[PDB]
């Protein structure tokens, strides 16, 4: 640097670059009682308890 010395570009360029971004994580749905209870009779009642 100096108080009277500028720099100037003469030739230029283009540099196409990528910018990846997430949008949607895999929309998952978990059954409330199918996972927890193996579709039984007493366990399901104990769950809704």
């Amino acid at each position: 640097y100096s108080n009277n010395s500028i720099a100037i570009p003469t030739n230029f360029t283009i540099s196409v670059t990528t910018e990846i971004l997430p949008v949607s994580m895999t929309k998952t749905s978990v059954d409330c009682t199918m996972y927890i209870c193996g579709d039984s009779t007493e366990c399901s009642n104990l769950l809704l308890q």
Binding site: S29, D31, T33, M34, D39
Partner: protein, 49 residues
């Protein structure tokens, strides 16, 4: 209920009959004598069968 989509419950299809299976054997296990053996072992040296 307004317009839209709603997951009411699950769809656990019921079974249509029962099936039980086992080892193709007819032997009994000698229990009654063990429970009524007049000749019985001691405790500090118990017998395993």
């Amino acid at each position: 209920v307004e317009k839209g989509i709603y997951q009411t419950s699950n769809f656990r299809v019921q079974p249509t009959e029962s099936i039980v299976r086992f080892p193709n054997i007819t032997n009994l296990c000698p229990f009654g004598e063990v429970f009524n053996a007049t000749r019985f072992a001691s405790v500090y040296a118990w017998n395993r069968k």
